[PDB]
Amino acid sequence: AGTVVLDDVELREAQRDYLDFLDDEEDQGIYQSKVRELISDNQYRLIVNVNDLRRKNEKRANRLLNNAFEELVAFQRALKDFVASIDATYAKQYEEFYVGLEGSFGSKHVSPRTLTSCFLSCVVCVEGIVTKCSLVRPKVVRSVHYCPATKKTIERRYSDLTTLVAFPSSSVYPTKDEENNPLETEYGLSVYKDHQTITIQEMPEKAPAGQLPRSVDVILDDDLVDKAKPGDRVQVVGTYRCLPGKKGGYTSGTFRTVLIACNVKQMSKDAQPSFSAEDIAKIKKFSKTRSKDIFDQLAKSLAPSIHGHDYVKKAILCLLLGGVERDLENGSHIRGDINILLIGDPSVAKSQLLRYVLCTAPRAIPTTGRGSSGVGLTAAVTTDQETGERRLEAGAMVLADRGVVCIDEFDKMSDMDRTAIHEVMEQGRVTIAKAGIHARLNARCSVLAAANPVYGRYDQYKTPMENIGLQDSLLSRFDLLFIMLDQMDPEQDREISDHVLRMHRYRAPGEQDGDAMPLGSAVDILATDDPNFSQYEKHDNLLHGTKKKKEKMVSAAFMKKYIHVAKIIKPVLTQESATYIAEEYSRLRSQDSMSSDTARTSPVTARTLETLIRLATAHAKARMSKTVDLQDAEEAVELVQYAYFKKVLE
């Protein structure tokens, strides 16, 4: 053969439609700005919301989603044309520009179980958990060969025939000149694109509870390779395709299918935020208006469904803001995470606070007493069994690096596990070694833990030392230790019960009118978008989640935005704050700090001094202060003074 096409009508029309869609200037300017932004960010993939195409062109959107390969070829040619129009040299740098897809794939949004053969050559959106990743390998796309005898230089092109027919002429590597002079390959002048394969499995929480998991293979090519690691929950948008078998004279009719990714995005749509100019202005005004009691307002707005526990909510706000790590020049390290332990009577809502943090913070990992044992909590070392090499496996605390581990039923863990937690809790790292490999994994996680005292209910007539069952070294790791009692006072009972009944009465606004909460039975989730991978008035409207209109509460979305901005602040200890903190620490170390019939809940060590510093720093962050002023220090000291002592009754 050797035929060329003379202005194919469908490809011409498609490229015209796609370039019309991309050239957004008479329209809102969205994708024209996006293409500028990839030029400036020095990238060559544009992610296109398919809903925008449906809005602009139903016919393109449907044809693209149902005939993915040639449509995507048209739309990448149109993208290259458009990029050249904006900037021809940038378009000259990259051989091809790519298009990823995003948005709402209605029936094309599948799971690895539901990705059947009717989606072949369609765009699909598959969600699952990465079970295995291959190594990132380079695949040669253009080899350059020098002939030392003739001084000639040769280039050979290898087209991407991953899912196409590949005749053997298409894969020969040149080794000889025409008259059998040897060629030497120019590695630096050749072009490679790196290639990866991952397997996506149906998420265990979404799989039918009875049977074995279903998987799909995914080919990742350049820009997309290291986007996912084993254990990650990801969306992969791409084309579902049959791979060719080898040449043979006989075939079973059986084909091996893969998904060729055009886009990979993490479930952590909570690990990447989006700030508009108005959002930033709102944050700045919220911080400037009341730069004194802003912390209290944020704390009291934290777990609105839980009544009470004002100090505990302040402490959780400090944990969510964190301190600042000290990275000394000689490589030494002081941690900047706050670890909190909640001891208390049954049914005082400490699991509710852990659940709130789980649904609120980014990179938050849940774990219960005996459901994460040994190597499931810190890292593990296993042997590859294919290459025979040792590999690392990240446990709960490595996966929560720069995040939170919410350890529920902390008292029901084994002592082996609780002593494995020590190094992560203080030095923020996991050190694991077998013979062929030794690593030091970063686990810079804060620990929010909830436990019951020994005897299940807290005895008020015993010291907190013997109600908590924890040894002093472990207790020292937790910088704040809250005893949450069930004081059966009638007045506090009235407060709690009125609150609880108001939350049991609340009905969502208009969305519901007397109806039930759907179970979400695995075909309903694929019907809509996944909120996990999905795409701000500073206050909530008041109805009866609160009794009366006397004090406003911060919006959850705005609070996420505000805390994300404030977490980056690095306030500095001022000399007055440092002197005050030092004096308070020396007072607190002393016996006069505790009266008679009051007892220490946890020991006061140098870790308590860093606790004061970290709490004061978090308080300063809440105000966006850039300095740790005396008010921050005294707030931290009252937190510590509250948590570290308990009156014992007779």
């Binding site: 027919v165 590949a166 039918p208 049959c242 791979l243 060719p244 078998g245 040449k247 084909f255």
Partner: protein, 98 residues
């Protein structure tokens, strides 16, 4: 190559390669069926049968289901090339399925 008329010079032996994107594929599942426990004679190993399901029969059942299957008792037809190793003293035997 059957079209060796559009030119006098000829094509090779075995010139054909499957075109994977031009193939119409359908769904495909294999099931293992075990004899019903009440139907197994008293001291007796259960009988098994391999089942071959297809487009909309795929994923209609799960392991553990009691089913009634209707289908063709058929043998595998992959080309009378039987050269097994240590076992299989048996000649003229092909794998059955429904």
């Amino acid at each position: 190559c059957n079209t060796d008329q559009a030119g006098r010079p000829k094509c090779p032996l075995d010139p054909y390669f499957i075109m994977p994107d031009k193939c119409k594929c359908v769904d495909f599942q294999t099931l293992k069926l075990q004899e019903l426990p009440d139907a197994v004679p008293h001291g007796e190993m259960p009988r098994h049968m391999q089942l071959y399901c297809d487009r909309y029969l795929c994923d209609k059942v799960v392991p553990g289901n009691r089913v009634t299957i209707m289908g063709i008792y058929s043998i595998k037809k992959f080309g009378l090339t039987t050269s097994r190793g240590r076992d299989r003293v048996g000649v003229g035997i092909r794998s059955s399925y429904i």
